[PDB]
Amino acid sequence: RSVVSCPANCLCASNILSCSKQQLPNVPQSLPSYTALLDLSHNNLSRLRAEWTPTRLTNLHSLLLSHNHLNFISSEAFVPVPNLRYLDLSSNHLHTLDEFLFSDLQALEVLLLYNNHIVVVDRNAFEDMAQLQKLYLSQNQISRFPVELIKLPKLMLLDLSSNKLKKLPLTDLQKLPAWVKNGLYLHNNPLECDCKLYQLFSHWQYRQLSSVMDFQEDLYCMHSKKLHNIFSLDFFNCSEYKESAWEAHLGDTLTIRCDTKQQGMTKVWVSPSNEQVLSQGSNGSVSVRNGDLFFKKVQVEDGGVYTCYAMGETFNETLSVELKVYNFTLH
Amino acid sequence: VVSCPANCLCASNILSCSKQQLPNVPQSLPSYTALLDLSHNNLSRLRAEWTPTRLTNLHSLLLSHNHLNFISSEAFVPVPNLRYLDLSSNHLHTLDEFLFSDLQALEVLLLYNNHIVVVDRNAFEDMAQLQKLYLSQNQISRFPVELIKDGNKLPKLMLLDLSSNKLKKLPLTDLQKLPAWVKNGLYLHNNPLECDCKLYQLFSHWQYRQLSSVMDFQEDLYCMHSKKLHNIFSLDFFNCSEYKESAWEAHLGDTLTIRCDTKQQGMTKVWVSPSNEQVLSQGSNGSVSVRNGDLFFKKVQVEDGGVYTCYAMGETFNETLSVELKVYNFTLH
Ligand SMILES: *[C@@H]1O[C@H](CO)[C@@H](O[C@@H]2O[C@H](CO)[C@@H](O[C@@H]3O[C@H](CO)[C@@H](O)[C@H](O)[C@@H]3O)[C@H](O)[C@H]2NC(C)=O)[C@H](O)[C@H]1NC(C)=O
Numbered sequence A: 001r002s003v004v005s006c007p008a009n010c011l012c013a014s015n016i017l018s019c020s021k022q023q024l025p026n027v028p029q030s031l032p033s034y035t036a037l038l039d040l041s042h043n044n045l046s047r048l049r050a051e052w053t054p055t056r057l058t059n060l061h062s063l064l065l066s067h068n069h070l071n072f073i074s075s076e077a078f079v080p081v082p083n084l085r086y087l088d089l090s091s092n093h094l095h096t097l098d099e100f101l102f103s104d105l106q107a108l109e110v111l112l113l114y115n116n117h118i119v120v121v122d123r124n125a126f127e128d129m130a131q132l133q134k135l136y137l138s139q140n141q142i143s144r145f146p147v148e149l150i151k152l153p154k155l156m157l158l159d160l161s162s163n164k165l166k167k168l169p170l171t172d173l174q175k176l177p178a179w180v181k182n183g184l185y186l187h188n189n190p191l192e193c194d195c196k197l198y199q200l201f202s203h204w205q206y207r208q209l210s211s212v213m214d215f216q217e218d219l220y221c222m223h224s225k226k227l228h229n230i231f232s233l234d235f236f237n238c239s240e241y242k243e244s245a246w247e248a249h250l251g252d253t254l255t256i257r258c259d260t261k262q263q264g265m266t267k268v269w270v271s272p273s274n275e276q277v278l279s280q281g282s283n284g285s286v287s288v289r290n291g292d293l294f295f296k297k298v299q300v301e302d303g304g305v306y307t308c309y310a311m312g313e314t315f316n317e318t319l320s321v322e323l324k325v326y327n328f329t330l331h
Numbered sequence B: 001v002v003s004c005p006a007n008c009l010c011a012s013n014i015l016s017c018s019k020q021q022l023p024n025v026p027q028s029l030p031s032y033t034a035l036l037d038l039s040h041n042n043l044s045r046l047r048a049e050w051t052p053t054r055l056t057n058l059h060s061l062l063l064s065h066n067h068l069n070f071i072s073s074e075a076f077v078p079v080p081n082l083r084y085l086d087l088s089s090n091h092l093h094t095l096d097e098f099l100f101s102d103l104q105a106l107e108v109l110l111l112y113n114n115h116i117v118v119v120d121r122n123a124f125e126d127m128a129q130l131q132k133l134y135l136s137q138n139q140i141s142r143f144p145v146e147l148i149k150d151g152n153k154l155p156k157l158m159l160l161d162l163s164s165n166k167l168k169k170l171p172l173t174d175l176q177k178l179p180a181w182v183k184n185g186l187y188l189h190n191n192p193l194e195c196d197c198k199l200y201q202l203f204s205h206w207q208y209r210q211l212s213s214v215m216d217f218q219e220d221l222y223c224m225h226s227k228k229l230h231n232i233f234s235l236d237f238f239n240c241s242e243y244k245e246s247a248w249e250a251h252l253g254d255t256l257t258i259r260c261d262t263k264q265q266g267m268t269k270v271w272v273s274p275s276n277e278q279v280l281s282q283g284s285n286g287s288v289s290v291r292n293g294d295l296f297f298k299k300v301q302v303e304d305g306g307v308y309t310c311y312a313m314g315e316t317f318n319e320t321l322s323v324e325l326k327v328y329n330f331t332l333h
């Protein structure tokens, strides 16, 4: 009749436990160690306690806890689930993400935290999360941009839409790889209206980043109250947006990235002499490392426009960078 | 922050539209949608035009806990790049031919806890990427051997959950021939299987191999003969012979391939010879070569006899598999 290992209030489909919409105030007892996906959504959990599971769950890859009343998560809550890849904590009552809260989840690739009551995000909430690619933080009350996350090595989607962001670290945002910008969602926030902000988003629009293209109508700033679509604002003394032009001193060591929109594309660099920059030796001058331009000791004769021809499955990109070599220092 | 359809929460590329007792799918679904959650609603039909838009960015479609009793033969035309589809806990009664054939990138299909009585092999035709199919808690009485039998198999299917159905008979000779990586995810527990010794011998082997399909569910692997339930692993007590290993016998000059029959794909295989030397190579007179990850004898010699060991190395576990070769000093042709 019933599966012996199946906890109360669950439908057990081999390694899937469907325990949703069961009015549960606590996690079912005696969860089996073979569990791969635990769906506890639409319940009435308020605390994810230390020892919510006395056993393992070394096989657990997905934990779904959305639509509960979670307002507390133990500092020990993720010790039992080391191999977790996907965690849905959306639609809960979470308010503050303490230091080291998710730091045990070193295999996690997706974290959903949208539609909570989050007012504070600690600088160390996500420390050690090396595998994390997507972090959804929409529909909260976050007012401090989590600058530490972009100053998470694999993070390629950071959704901070529908929050209380006003001030942005624009210089940090400018230096971000285009593959991160592509998934950095800042729509539906009372951002400060500013020429530099227009310039940031206008660049992203030129590059056709999804973050802008998908949400153009929702990209707001706010000036003395009011709220305006950023692209509706014509700023005085505000230039179009600057082409990419590294400046170096004679003798510098320097790496220049091919700033593609998406990872894993095929990159070929062509020098200003119209020669292919080769990956080969450890001698000088210019070479390609990892897919970036590398100059061991920049010379006057280096410099000019280098072009990276990048090829993907769905699109290509042609990105130019001007190296300007200065024969003097101004300090 | 809309573009957001009426009864949905839109979090960039995620639409969460669950538990709103919707009788139809929200209108004007945005093309940027990556995951669409319409679970715990009142949908009864997934019609040809559930989405006029076309959701080429959709990878997950969650439709569990609805009242779905009908899916259009064109329902999956708009979601060509779908990887994960949950149709569990619905009222689905038949799996019509070619029903999922538009889902050529689908990796996981959940159909557990429905009213499915009969599985048509053609419902899953051309699903080249389908890795996991969950069909537990239905009323299935015939084992769909065509899903996994060499000839017309789904090539990447590595988990087939048929637990908690109405299975009485299995195609045991067909199941024995399967690679252990398929057997490892073939779940047959909590079915009224007829007790017989061939049944015991199959599961006895799987148990010795520590396949998850057995190790995780030993207590739910039961059989009926007669109207009383027995645990399959009690059949040794009833005088059934244990699992019989294991030849292998060759004649001089034979050409022979021996698989390292590991329970997970993608493991590194290292073969060692009866003389305790690594096999190696692919030249290859003649006389131990390793090809793909298989032991290969182009022309068996009497010196080639003995026990060969395959050490298989994976991320989470390792296996050691031994095969004994016996060589006759003559050839019958
Ligand atoms: C979801 O779980 C919570 C936590 O148990 C439930 O909240 C609790 O609801 C009960 C009413 O069912 C409240 O009981 C009352 O408590 C006060 C003292 O606090 C007492 O004076 C009353 O006589 C009464 O017994 C309880 O306060 C409340 N606890 C909390 C922390 O809010 C909730 O009902 C559960 N929801 C469902 C619908 O399953």
Ligand SMILES: *[C@@H]1O[C@H](CO)[C@@H](O[C@@H]2O[C@H](CO)[C@@H](O[C@@H]3O[C@H](CO)[C@@H](O)[C@H](O)[C@@H]3O)[C@H](O)[C@H]2NC(C)=O)[C@H](O)[C@H]1NC(C)=O
Pocket (backbone or CB within 6 Å): B021, B023, B042
């Ligand atoms: C969403 O789907 C659920 C399906 O369960 C609907 O709930 C069901 O609603 C019907 C009424 O439409 C309820 O039936 C009633 O039963 C009583 C007593 O026998 C009878 O006097 C009424 O005339 C009617 O037949 C039924 O109890 C209820 N089922 C459950 C499980 O709660 C719900 O109506 C649907 N929502 C929408 C918005 O369509």
